């Protein structure tokens, strides 16, 4: 009388809490897990105002999901994380994630301190580090059937009935499109459109961007071929001073003499945009209904409003200067773009600037007969940049199919031979957990995931095929990068390093306190 | 349109299932672990009203919890089942199978199917139950020594300190004492007795009852040495008859003629039991204040309405005659008894039948400073009374201290090596698991378990060792049984086989469907 | 205007109504479809007490899920009559019947009107009827080496580890020995009684009965060779008659002279009971006090208010006749037993009628560790008894492993070809249907039903083995009559002709009007 | 599992969709047809 600690808090201490952050990563886990590899299924998501979503996407699931419970969240960053940094794989992250907890309960369960397990964990997980970097196969930058196959992997994971060549090939041209003069991929140079039209594979690639306005007046044309662009940020109105200023007229006459004055600079405003030689104008605010009229006389196509990240993407697609002053525009700072047309698509009316030949932004189109039909394909056009992306920036490629696992696994074992005692447990654990993906991949797939395993140890046995990976299709351990079947080094390296380092730090507590 | 399953229902399937079994049988393990073992520590459990409890004991902690979980009651099932096969072990049988469950867990996360598991499991319970058979040593059901040995484990497993030479010697008696013409012990011919007094070695053995009455008058004698006793099962009151019948009186005279011959027909059944040389008796039920007098004036000592129980006991210990008819009274229907004497325990007034030559029913009388403190005792020398009670009926043994397990464990491993494929998992996974008695035991001590496991493990290997395992106090591994440390193989025999049993059908779960 | 039918009333019509009968059923079909066959799974029942029911037993899980649906409780009614004519397959009936609705929904999505499905099922059930019949081997009804393999294959159905080849042979000792003289094998006959013990395997065949009671006296033997054993029905007490009687006593000595003489009537009561020879009695009603003793004085052991449901199941085992007049108690009418012994069990005191000569009533004593481990063996040993007696009463039978389904069903579609109209496609869908078995077990053993199914017919068309079947244990197509897996020709029979009626009666259905 | 129309929602179909508007769109015809013609007759409504 009284307690010390609030009487309004729950409190799991010893076994209990670590059982409890234990079986809270383990559920998260095994909620996406059934989602892994070509033969996996997807989730309908349903919220509270009766939205729904459908997706084979990891971490989309896990964000969708109201998870609630403290550690469950901590897993979810893993995946988080692993959609920041590499864009794909997030399945993987959080499924190693939940089998490294897993594992780590029957080292526990012998009484092995945590701190020990801890210590393993990551001395197993430095040393996948080391081993990932010999495994892996470099690639340049340019190596477009490469690049091309690194992007069907990844479509196919989403299932093998989205991942069309055309697809790949459109993907692939994008990112190579938007690659900076230092090697570096910006995955939001590559503008994401969706419009619902006859089918999937009307999906086409832009040289240029799409713009969701109309041209300001009809008597503009609609079209216009090898155009020169104008991006200004002004206003096209009449200029007002910053300080107070009233006008003050006594003489009747001088009435008009205002009134003209007002639109004889808006006449001069157009007639300098006309000088710089521009036919294409896009304007951030607004554009007097005088001005207008003035454009459409001289025959300049101009739209009015453009939303900034619009601009923005105007500029880095045509190479043309956001003008921040209509008497400092000069003809350097003019786009030039193919082709500049005022076109419905879908029954909505856009400005579609394209055909640019060297442009640093453009913008995947991507169709479809219905609203989340397409929103998939999106998700899976989203992975398949990432990865694309992340090959173009290290040149460094492992094969997929959970061969990568099972060589690593097996590296790991025979690393664990030279260490002493009981932390040995430990990396042993790190490299049994590995396996939770080739023997995922074989369950969803139907097969026995126990025979397939010794099949695949098998094959990567002393000096044998470090690509050696099962076949999800044909049932077989193949050659999987003989088959195509390739992804970035960094899926499995951010994956890796997530999972380990988010288990570490839930492994360290004993101890759990919650409020309300 | 309606569902066709009551909407008033959780239902768990495939994994969810086999987690709630699993998970609430380990769980419900857990709790009693900590009591195993000399080191092992007590619970105090209170109930709805405010009754206390606090044992060491397992069947009892786990009946005094009210646990509604579905699976947690089949393994309440196992404690409740080892109680009345043995008496001792409770705990153990417990703990094996919630090992068992947790071993099975990492099987079926691996995709070895749950009929597999159960096979393996069936498999290696039956070769266990073949090994502990060619590990069990054979005793005489009248070796005093090992049946002290017996005794003296049973109570140690409680606590060193309730382990007093004396009061295993006391139980060894108690129980040889009850055994019958085929060698069989009945736990009920040992009646307990729980008395408050000075100390917990005042607990002594009675050649006889104490039965809960006194004498019905108090001009009888209280104390009466060499006494022959008879047993009523009849009322000595005036009999009636069982057809109905009544009396007419029409002559004044006629009253006291009744009166009279009602007054002699009670002078006579005291008189017929004076003859047969009855001096103590025990009437099952009443005895008319009159004829009370007239055994008074004999010198004859007389409890009135005794339990029919103490009269099946009184029987039982002193060689008398439960008689029905006074008639049929004679002097080879009485019992024989040193000493009955009306004194008082602890202020309760009672009858002690006492120093009987040759009783087959006898009374542990149990003495301790506080109620609570007694209870306890009692529950260890139940247990004891137990194993002794198995020793003599099967004259087989095994060493303690893990030390049984150990040698299984071991040995059920080299029969794991000539199973085929998957099965074998199962069978190495069930030999893993009784190796639980031996950790926990460690555990419980503050010892290190893994390490110990190593030493035990060790001493019993290249043809080593049975009887090695840890001493819980040297922290060295000794040999059990030059140490007497020694229990029933039939301790061994119902725990293994109660606990595969139990698990077996609960790991053939897949559907658990639950109302309200 | 106020509204005819009621207000609270739920209505369903035409396809609504069709499709909710034809789910319900499919529905119920699906919750027990996860049990069938050897690789079977059990599920866990809870109810709103907290009691518990874990069990592999189709009809047993339908019952105790209290459904409230309709159409599904139309469908239990398949189950609970495959239990009472048969006493397994009751999986296999609701499975078949779930099956036709499903093959019905096909047809009814096609315009075929439901009369005319109806009309097909029937004609395709009774040519299955036909072709059952002549499918059948002809077999002995006391060929112990084909029953043991029918009681060998009902208890495997169960699980394989629940198959104890001794197991088989006492239910065939068990069932033999009740079959009348017209050789019909009366399932109350064999009487179950369930004790925990040591294990499964502790369970026996007791050619007798057990009795749950005491012997009055402890005088009495406890143990008795080959005795004489009488049956009374009426009480051995002082008789009184029916007419209103009353004694008048005026005479003070003629007072003990109705003690006494209601005494010797007692005494008398023993006296003729010894001269029939007697040394054991069974009364139904009470027996007084004194006459108890009198009865010890003759070692007579005696049990008092024995319940009328043993008195009938003692005379069936020893031969005796129920007595319900001490005066007319003759040596004929005396039972005989090899030994009457009370002795305890499970710690239970209890009577044991055990060794008779010519039983006709007996006793399955079945053992197990814990109590709900024990349920499920009895429900195992009550289905074999069933299908132990199927065989003895009809001597027919058939192979098992869905082989049978899969002969029955290639033989129908040869029938539905020369079948005009849209009748036909009833007829091939009633055939189709039966392949739900073999595809169920095939399903249930992590096999691939499709491939297999083509297997099996393979094996089958061309003459032709008909007892071809997939073996679950080895996933290879085996003769299944060589491999001893067969079962009784009812079981099909039964099966089939309840499912197709119940449906039939549910495909009429247009119409649902649900009250409250 | 959940309804797919709004279980919020009373639905007539068949004959009874029939009989409904049938019977409404007369009910609401026989409530004028007194004040037809020359002798018809005046509602009073109050609202
Ligand atoms: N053709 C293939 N055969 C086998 N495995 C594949 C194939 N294509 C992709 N995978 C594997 O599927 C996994 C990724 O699947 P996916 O469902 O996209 O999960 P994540 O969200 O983790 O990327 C990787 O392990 C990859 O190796
Ligand atoms: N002196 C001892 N040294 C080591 N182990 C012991 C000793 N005495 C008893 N044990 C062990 O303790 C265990 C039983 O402890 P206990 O708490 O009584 O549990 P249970 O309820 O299962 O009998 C057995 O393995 C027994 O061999
Ligand atoms: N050894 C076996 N191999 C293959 N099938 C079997 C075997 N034993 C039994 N069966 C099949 O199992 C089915 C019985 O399933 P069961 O679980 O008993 O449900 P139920 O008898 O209640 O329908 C029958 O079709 C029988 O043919
Ligand atoms: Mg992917
Ligand atoms: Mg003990
Ligand atoms: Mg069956």
Request: aromatic letters at 2%; glycine letters at 8%; one cysteine or more.
């Amino acid at each position: 009388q009284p307690g010390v600690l609030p009487e309004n808090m729950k409190r799991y201490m010893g076994r209990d809490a670590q059982r409890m952050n234990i079986l809270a990563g383990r559920i998260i886990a095994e909620t996406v897990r059934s989602t892994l590899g070509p033969k996996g299924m997807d989730k309908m998501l349903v919220d509270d105002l009766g939205d729904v979503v459908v997706t084979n996407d990891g971490v989309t699931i896990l964000r969708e999901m109201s998870v609630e419970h403290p550690a469950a969240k901590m897993l979810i960053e893993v995946a988080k994380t692993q959609e920041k940094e590499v864009g794909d794989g997030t399945t993987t992250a959080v499924v190693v994630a939940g089998e490294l907890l897993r594992k780590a309960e029957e080292l526990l369960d012998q009484n092995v301190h945590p701190t020990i397990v801890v210590k393993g964990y990551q001395a197993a997980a430095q040393k996948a580090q080391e081993l990932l970097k010999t495994i892996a196969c470099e690639v340049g930058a340019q190596d477009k059937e490469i690049l091309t196959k690194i992007a069907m992997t990844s479509i196919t994971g989403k299932g093998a009935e989205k991942a069309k060549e055309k697809l790949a090939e459109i993907i692939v041209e994008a990112v190579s499109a938007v690659v900076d003069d230092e090697g570096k991929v910006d995955k939001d140079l590559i503008k994401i459109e969706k419009k619902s039209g006859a089918s999937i594979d009307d999906t086409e690639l832009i040289k240029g961007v799409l713009v969701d306005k109309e041209r300001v007046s009809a008597q503009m044309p609609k079209k216009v071929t090898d155009a020169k662009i104008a991006l200004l940020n002004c206003a096209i109105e009449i200029k007002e001073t910053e300080t107070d200023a009233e006008i003050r007229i006594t003489d009747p006459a001088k009435l008009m003499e205002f009134i003209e004055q007002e639109e004889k600079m808006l006449k001069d405003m157009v007639a300098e945009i006309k000088a710089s030689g521009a036919n294409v104008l896009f304007c951030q605010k607004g554009i007097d209904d005088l001005a207008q009229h003035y454009l459409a006389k001289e025959g300049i196509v101009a739209a009015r409003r453009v939303k900034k990240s619009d601009m923005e993407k105007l500029a880095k697609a045509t190479g043309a200067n956001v003008i921040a002053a209509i008497a400092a525009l000069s003809a350097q700072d003019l786009g030039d773009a193919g082709l500049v047309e005022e076109r419905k698509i879908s029954g909505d009316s856009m400005i579609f600037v394209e055909e640019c030949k060297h442009p640093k932004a453009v913008t995947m189109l991507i169709r479809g007969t219905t609203e989340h039909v397409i929103e998939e394909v999106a998700r899976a056009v989203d992975d398949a940049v990432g990865v694309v992306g992340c090959t173009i920036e290290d040149g460094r490629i492992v094969s997929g199919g959970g061969s990568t696992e099972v060589e690593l696994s097996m590296k790991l074992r025979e690393y664990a031979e030279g260490i002493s005692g009981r932390e040995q447990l430990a990396v042993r654990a790190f490299a049994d957990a590995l396996e939770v993906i080739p023997r995922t991949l074989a369950e969803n797939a139907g097969l026995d995931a126990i025979e397939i395993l010794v099949k695949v140890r098998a094959a990567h046995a002393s000096n044998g095929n470090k690509c050696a990976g099962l076949n999800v299709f044909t049932g077989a351990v193949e050659d999987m990068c003989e088959n195509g079947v390739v992804e970035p080094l960094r899926v499995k390296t951010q994956a890796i390093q997530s999972a380990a380092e988010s288990t570490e730090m839930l492994l360290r507590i004993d101890d759990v306190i919650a409020a309300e």
